[PDB]
Amino acid sequence: AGALVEIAEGMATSIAELQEGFNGSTDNPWNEMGFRIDKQVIEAKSRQLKA
Amino acid sequence: YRVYIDQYAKQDYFTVGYKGPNEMDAGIYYAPYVALTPLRGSDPKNFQPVM
């Protein structure tokens, strides 16, 4: 209905300039990205017949 | 008399001194030890250079 629309914006170069404790500011970290590397494991199930 | 100005003079005055031929005969000694060793760095929280 156009009421609530969708955006992406930048970071005011006043805020970005001092980010994570510059010029006396605090409590404002940068955002970070890591990675993970977790593993999977399978097992071999058997099977068989007779006559 | 060598008449030096004092360009910042909070009232007014003239201070009649003595400076001998030697640097030993002075009345006050300004002895430099190290000089303006420049230092640099960057705070890794905010990355922005301090000097």
CA A8/CA B32 separation, integer angstroms = 58
Torsional sign, CA B50, B40, B35, B33: positive
Q: Is A18 exposed, middle or buried (0-12, 13-18, 19+ CB in 10 A)?
A: middle
Instruction: Pick the residue from chain A with its C-alpha nearest to B44.
Output: A20
B46 near A CB under 8 A: yes
**Which phi-psi region, left, alpha or beta, contains residue B21 (left: φ > 0; alpha: ψ -120 to 50)?**
alpha
Query: Which residues lie closer than 8 Å to A21 by C-beta, 6 or more apart?
Result: A28, B43, B45, B46
From the CA of A40, how many Å to the nearest CA of chain B?
Answer: 36
Contact between A10 and A19 (Cβ < 8 Å): no
CB contact under 8 A, A17 and B48: yes
